[PDB]
Amino acid sequence: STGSATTTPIDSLDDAYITPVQIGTPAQTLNLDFDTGSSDLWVFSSETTASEVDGQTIYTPSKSTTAKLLSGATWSISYGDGSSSSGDVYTDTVSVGGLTVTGQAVESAKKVSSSFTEDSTIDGLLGLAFSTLNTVSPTQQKTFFDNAKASLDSPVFTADLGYHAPGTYNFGFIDTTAYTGSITYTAVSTKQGFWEWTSTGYAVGSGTFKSTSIDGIADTGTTLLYLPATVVSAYWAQVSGAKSSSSVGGYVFPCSATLPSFTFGVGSARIVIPGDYIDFGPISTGSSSCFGGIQSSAGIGINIFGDVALKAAFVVFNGATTPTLGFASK
């Protein structure tokens, strides 16, 4: 089997991407944030504290003839940005772009933090990291990909995120029309539960390539590119007026600037992020200070190849017995 679904930016800055997901019988369609940096499929629901729901579409398990309470199971997750959610668990039928999993754990939120409530466009998350990170207790649950894997034509999914435009998640096949040149594959460590790999270096604009190993994760659920402070400083030094602002929470730059590109290495291959992908707009409405799309990972504890980086590539998440990652230009 295969599946293919369009993923759509939630706003004009590509702050996140939502992908429609069918849950239950009859189908209830929710727009979920596909997140290769976590492993829980959780949804706003009829059980979510009423004051914490503000415009999201909810899953109502009592209206699904295929929903079953997973008795005794609970979940609770906290993300890198300080946001969180928790609740109980149902199993139900879940379909993405024509690909159907029966008995998928659907984690129903009883509580969500303010960041989630305030974002009316995201109805929940669909985790695509390794199932070892799944938070369900006392019986850990499998991701949608893990459940689908054996049924797929090939044990892969691909992320093709757009810049200020829709893109595609495919399951079970590689669309050879969706990228240019060849796909370069690179090793993955699953030791921390992530799609963790080592970039071979970087360049800023038309500058020379610096060969240096940068360990990080391919994370569709993180908006920006988070890299070591040395790398980030080298990038922003090429932008007149750019500075790190503790009050804003990272690098800002004059909105009048033309940003240079940023290149990252994948083996001997190179992925070029155009300068415009690195502009996240005014820090507040009407400001002439703009937020940068490349930020320091210092204090995160891991480098993160988030959407800024991934949307410059066609990305293969290869879930073979020894997982790997593939990147192509597009």
UniProtKB/Swiss-Prot annotation:
* Record keywords, A-Z: Aspartyl protease, Disulfide bond, Hydrolase, Protease, Signal, Zymogen
**Class in the EC hierarchy, top level:** hydrolase
Q: Where is the Peptidase A1 domain?
A: 17-328
Active-site residues?
Answer: D35, S199
- Give yes or no: UniProt keyword DNA-binding: no
Q: Which reaction does it catalyse?
A: Hydrolysis of proteins with specificity similar to that of pepsin A, prefers hydrophobic residues at P1 and P1', but does not cleave 14-Ala-|-Leu-15 in the B chain of insulin or Z-Glu-Tyr. Clots milk
The disulfide bridges present are C255-C290
Q: Which superkingdom?
A: Eukaryota
GO biological process per UniProt: proteolysis
Write out the GO MF terms: aspartic-type endopeptidase activity
EC number in record: 3.4.23.22
Q: Which family does it belong to?
A: Belongs to the peptidase A1 family.
- State the name under which the record lists this protein: Endothiapepsin
- The shown range, given as first to last of full length, is 90 to 419 of 419
